[PDB]
């Protein structure tokens, strides 16, 4: 695609996109073009508006495009093209990615006793309401726990809310505790949005007893 400004918009929240180089108020020679999950390729929106699109994306008096409540299907590309009073042409190019923050992750079905030297189901971490899916991961004593090594295995599951499209993630941790290890280890789970600069959410720890 072309060079664009990256926009991350939260689902359910309004979004205002500026049309650079447009006069402050009508009359304005400007045109918005968008290609999203709602469109068949490009769709043109004008200052006068009209039709079903007014509910979704509307041109404001200053020429900005306004979406009162962003949804998943609004992901895509938004372009404005405008001329000023001087006849100079100015283009605005936005890449819009949408997201939603899940609620705090939780550990369910956690074991209270582990036996060293054999595999143990430690617990199940669940995260509800994310977009995009993101990922779950486990930590032991404040350090990342890598699957498939050191007797550690993880199984993962992703489900989608039938109406909202938001993801629910589930992760089951199994460990084989080494002999002569910590009798009271501390495990925790965290959610990573994956989306740049978004912060992780962390579960409350679980502290099972380990039998030698």
Residue 1 interacts with Na ion (CB under 5 A): yes or no: yes
Interface mask (CB under 5 A) for Na ion, residues 77-106, using x and -?
Answer: x-----------------------------
Q: Which is nearer to Na ion, 7 or 133 (CB)?
A: 7
Residue 2 interacts with Na ion (CB under 5 A): yes or no: yes
Distance CA 37, CA 11 (A): 14
Residue 3 interacts with Na ion (CB under 5 A): yes or no: no
Q: Which is nearer to Na ion, 1 or 180 (CB)?
A: 1
Interface mask (CB under 5 A) for Na ion, residues 27-66, using x and -?
Answer: ----------------------------------------
- HEC-encoded secondary structure of 176-208: CCCCCCCCCCCEEEEEECCCCCCCCEECCCECC
Q: First vs last Cα of the chain: how many Å apart?
A: 59
Interface mask (CB under 5 A) for Na ion, residues 4-23, using x and -?
Answer: x-------------------
Q: Which is nearer to Na ion, 4 or 116 (CB)?
A: 4
Binding site for Na ion (CB under 5 A): 1-2, 4, 77
């Amino acid at each position: 695609g072309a060079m664009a400004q990256n926009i991350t918009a939260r689902i359910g929240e309004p979004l205002v996109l500026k049309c650079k180089g447009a006069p402050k108020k009508p009359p304005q020679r400007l045109e918005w073009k968008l290609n999203t999950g709602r469109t068949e390729a490009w769709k043109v929106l004008s200052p006068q508006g009209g039709g079903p699109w007014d509910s979704v994306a509307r041109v404001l008096p200053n020429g900005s495009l306004f979406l009162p409540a962003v949804g998943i299907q609004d992901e895509g590309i938004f372009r404005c093209q405008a001329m000023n009073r001087n006849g100079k042409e100015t283009k605005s190019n936005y890449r819009v990615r949408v997201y939603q923050i899940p609620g705090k992750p939780e550990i369910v079905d956690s074991a209270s006793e582990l036996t060293a030297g054999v595999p143990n189901k430690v617990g199940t971490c669940v995260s509800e309401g994310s977009y995009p899916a993101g990922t779950l991961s486990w930590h032991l004593d404040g350090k990342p726990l890598v699957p498939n090594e050191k007797g550690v295995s993880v199984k993962e599951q992703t489900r989608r809310h039938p109406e909202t499209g938001l993801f629910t993630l589930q992760s089951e941790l199994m460990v084989t505790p080494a002999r002569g290890g910590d009798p009271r280890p501390t495990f925790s789970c965290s959610f990573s949005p994956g989306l740049p600069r978004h912060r992780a959410l962390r579960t409350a720890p679980i502290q099972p007893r380990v039998w030698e």
